[PDB]
Ligand binder design. Structure first.
Ligand SMILES: *Cc1c(COP(=O)(O)O)cnc(C)c1O
Ligand SMILES: [Ca+2]
Ligand SMILES: [Ca+2]
Ligand SMILES: [Ca+2]
Ligand SMILES: [Co+2]
Length: 142
């Protein structure tokens, strides 16, 4: 109904132990799109709270070279402030490139206020970069 996957899927867990922090675990991705001449990609995940007019919240995973099915298993802490109720946690998969700019692969986002009320733990459909700033889509059940 909205869950046709065209860019792969990403496994995530997000919890807010208290209102002042969220813990984000980036698991793994499956079925990513090739964005290199070798038919592979070099994926990493960029995390930030948007809007970030001062570019101060960005964190990222390691890059996994030469794969369309990366496993990261990395956890990140965001320390939150009252202003963050207006913000969204942005999650973007990017293809690292050596000789050109990195290429966008897929994205999604979660409202901070929604994360403060309910945790995330599951697989998610990767969206285009524009959609990704506004929505997340849990994968459909079989
Ligand atoms: C839309 C969708 C379904 C069924 O979803 P409903 O909300 O029950 O209509 C099943 N699989 C995929 C991949 C879908 O996007
Ligand atoms: Ca590339
Ligand atoms: Ca690459
Ligand atoms: Ca490129
Ligand atoms: Co659907």
């Amino acid at each position: 109904x909205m869950h046709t996957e065209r860019r792969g899927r990403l496994q995530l867990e997000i919890r807010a132990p208290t209102a002042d922090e969220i813990h984000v675990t980036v698991g793994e991705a499956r079925n990513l799109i090739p964005m290199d001449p070798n038919g592979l990609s070099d994926p990493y995940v960029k995390l930030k709270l948007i809007p970030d007019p001062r570019n101060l919240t960005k964190q990222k995973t390691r890059t996994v070279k030469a794969t369309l099915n990366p496993v990261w298993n990395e956890t990140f802490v965001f320390n939150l402030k009252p202003g963050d109720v207006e913000r969204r946690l942005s999650v973007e998969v990017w293809d690292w490139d050596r000789t050109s700019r990195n290429d966008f692969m897929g994205a999604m986002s979660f409202g901070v206020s929604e994360l403060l009320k309910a945790p995330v733990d599951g697989w998610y459909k990767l969206l285009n970069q524009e959609e990704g700033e506004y929505y997340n889509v849990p994968v459909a059940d079989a």
